[PDB]
Design a protein around this ligand. Structure first.
Ligand SMILES: O=C(O)[C@H]1Cc2ccccc2CN1S(=O)(=O)c1ccc(-c2ccccc2)cc1
Ligand SMILES: [Ca+2]
Ligand SMILES: [Ca+2]
Ligand SMILES: [Zn+2]
Ligand SMILES: [Zn+2]
Length: 163
């Protein structure tokens, strides 16, 4: 469950910024998905996330298509959904979402809140889990989102890094 080399944030109050949006959800819907994805991790750790509207943030969030500057191009509809970088300066921590997906707040593929929640595990230093019940499992699946809380394996993982 931890990324190789154990990269972790040295501070526990991190900022984030949503750089752009996906047209398929309202702006408020995207903001809510992201807010709630961060809160999943915050309630199981000492981490506090502060949104900023402009300027430089620890965790940049953006929707991109195909080639987007980081040498890991997205691939169009389906396939890779999103990716994120391990804790560190600059691109470290940042989370990118494939702009060519269908992004939802429903049970229809792909629920943005769930994908974001998984990606922020990477942004915080977690690796993939082998535990098919974990949020950090390597394959997407819908789960009910209305009252969602971190699966136990992911609590264990974030606790192992940050207490
Ligand atoms: O893992 C990633 O971040 C990226 C990049 C990567 C790198 C190395 C190995 C596999 C993958 C798979 N992809 S992905 O886009 O296909 C993906 C995204 C989210 C979820 C997920 C799981 C559970 C709940 C909700 C979402 C699963 C897979
Ligand atoms: Ca960053
Ligand atoms: Ca894709
Ligand atoms: Zn990228
Ligand atoms: Zn992943």
């Amino acid at each position: 469950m931890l990324t190789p080399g154990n990269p972790k944030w040295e501070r526990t109050n991190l900022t984030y910024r949503i750089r752009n949006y996906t047209p398929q959800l309202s702006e408020a819907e995207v903001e809510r998905a992201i807010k709630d994805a961060f809160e999943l991790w915050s309630v199981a750790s000492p981490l506090i996330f502060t949104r900023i509207s402009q300027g430089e943030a620890d965790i940049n969030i953006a929707f991109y298509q195909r080639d987007h500057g980081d040498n890991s191009p997205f691939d169009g509809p389906n396939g890779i959904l999103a990716h994120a970088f391990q804790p560190g300066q600059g691109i470290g921590g940042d989370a990118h979402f494939d702009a060519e997906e269908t992004w939802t707040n429903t049970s229809a593929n792909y629920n943005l809140f769930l994908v974001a929640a998984h990606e922020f595990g990477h942004s915080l230093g977690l690796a993939h889990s082998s535990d098919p019940g974990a949020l950090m499992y390597p394959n997407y699946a819908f789960r009910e989102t209305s009252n969602y809380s971190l699966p136990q394996d992911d609590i264990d993982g974030i606790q192992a890094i940050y207490g």
